Design a protein around this ligand. Sequence first.
Ligand code: COA
Ligand code: MG
Lengths: 393, 311
Amino acid sequence: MNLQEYQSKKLMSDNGVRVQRFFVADTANEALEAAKRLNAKEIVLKAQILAGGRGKGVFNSGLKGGVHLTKDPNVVGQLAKQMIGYNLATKQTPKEGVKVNKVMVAEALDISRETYLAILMDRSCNGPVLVGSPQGGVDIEEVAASNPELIFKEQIDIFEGIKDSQAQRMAENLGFVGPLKSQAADQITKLYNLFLKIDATQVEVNPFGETPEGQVVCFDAKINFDDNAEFRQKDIFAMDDKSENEPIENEAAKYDLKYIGLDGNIACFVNGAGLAMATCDIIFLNGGKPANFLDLGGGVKEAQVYQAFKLLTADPKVEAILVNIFGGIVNCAIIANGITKACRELELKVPLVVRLEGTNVQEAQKILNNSGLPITSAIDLEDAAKKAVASVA
Amino acid sequence: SYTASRQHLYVDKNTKIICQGFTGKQGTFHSQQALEYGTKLVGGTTPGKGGQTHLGLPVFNTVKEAKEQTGATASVIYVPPPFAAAAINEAIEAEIPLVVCITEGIPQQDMVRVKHKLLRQEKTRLIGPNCPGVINPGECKIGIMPGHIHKKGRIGIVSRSGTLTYEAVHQTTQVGLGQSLCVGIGGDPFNGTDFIDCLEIFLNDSATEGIILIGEIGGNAEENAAEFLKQHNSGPNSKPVVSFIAGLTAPPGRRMGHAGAIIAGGKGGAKEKISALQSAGVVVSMSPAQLGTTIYKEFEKRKMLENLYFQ
Ligand SMILES: CC(C)(COP(=O)(O)OP(=O)(O)OC[C@H]1O[C@@H](n2cnc3c(N)ncnc32)[C@H](O)[C@@H]1OP(=O)(O)O)[C@@H](O)C(=O)NCCC(=O)NCCS
Ligand SMILES: [Mg+2]
């Protein structure tokens, strides 16, 4: 899932993390009013989209820049009217950009020094670890490649919680001295506790910043959430911003389906993450281009199979469909029933290669036979991939 | 240390099993199938139902009671995500030698907590979560893998993917080699058993003559296992290892179904794993369909080499 900037910063600010004070505006007039309300020396206006590169982006209104600074609320109003209801394109968006429905109006704070600070569930370390660097403002992977010695880490014991000594040493490691060490240490503690409360897999603050006036501030942040804790994070997941996701993925999520759109013309319909990845791979290995990844999970139900098959049949890029099922906890007849029910709605006009193995395969095969569908059978996964590729050669 | 519990992975005809989540939907169905398969399932747990009988077997409120009254040495968990970590914790507290957790969807923070307890003891070996289970064909099956595909044999299989395990089982049965022991370590980033755990059991098992290691994108467990195999499976008497790594075509920065299956920060790609395994002397099948035929060819090459130079 994804949060807009104003959503993550409120979440942090509501948990004692220091962010720049801000308001959110739906209209140019609200942006005007918010700007007056701030009583800030300088104001930064920020279009709310998820893609990066907002500052150098361009609106289809003609306006250059999705981030503007000014001291004058009228200028905030004039620029906002050139933002809201328009599409902001950046180096990380498609050419047509992303519609801007909201703008953030925030106090602009100078930054004296930029550091990096994150907390993540680190698989290598069996638990949470703090990750920090005095080299702020650059992707962490870049620092690791250039200057890995400037990457500091602390392993946090899940039951002890973060220790004062650990927050203090990381603050020192990031170059906060004297009064800003204790301040940064306190902010690190609050960020760690935020990280735990919200079932984040990562809370990444870049830059984690010190202002000329002696304030430690989280200027920008990115939070990744554990999908497995949605059941206890309903409020956060209700804020999910889906508007920059691939459309077919958004359709699949409505039915709890794991679908990932790829750059191909051979659709894949598979149970299991490993088998689904490998089906995409073996298509590539035999000289084809898979159109998607689709992982039917253990608890898939017939109505979900049905909706899943329709993600493929209604995709105009799809020129052939490779069904490959090795059923364990998945009953093959549920797959066959959902497929035949979906195909009852359309004149199937693409090749359909089908390979079925495992639980209840005999009954599933009979269901496919009774349908009268134009199915070309495959003896194994290599045979299926070769036939699917050839079917669109 | 926790490594001292690795031997508990090797279930056999003497393993006695209880089901956690006995009376639930999947607990009931897979317990029925285990009984019909002859596996020594002896009872199960559902809090608030101790004293009932299910499938002719006793139901208990707690693992401790179940273990004391049946002598069970293994538990299989079919408990839903909100409570499955407490279910693993209960089995650890009860000192059950082997715990197999099928459940998908346990919060990572829950499993970090479970792992903290797990690493500080050594009675209990955890397989999982989010895994198909473990099978010693014809002797003991604990999990969800399909029937009529296994054959007791010579190949040990360890896999982060359940469905790919079924493929490799089917392929090694079809080429006539069969499986000695098959362990699905599951697709979650925090789990109880890694590749190296299983490789140690395989390399020291006389019934295992070759190994299939099935991995995928994300993390660095395949890289670690490769270095382990390079150092400790490279002399004479070494055993052939064949691998397949899923996700060669996966896009970066996406979780490919598995919570653990993600190429993040430029790390976790399948190419880098294939190259590490290859440089360690593992033979990598590029195709997932060719695991049976690849390891069969490796056995035949070992035969020829042994007769050529090592009579
Ligand atoms: C674990 C899972 C199988 C449970 O699904 P389910 O059987 O349909 O769930 P149900 O709600 O019917 O049954 C769960 C049972 O656990 C019981 N339970 C709950 N907490 C428990 C605990 N701490 N200890 C024991 N039993 C517990 C419940 O009471 C319930 O039994 P009841 O209905 O008699 O009360 C499911 O969540 C799941 O993970 N499915 C996918 C598994 C998978 O694909 N794994 C990966 C394979 S590689
Ligand atoms: Mg699955």
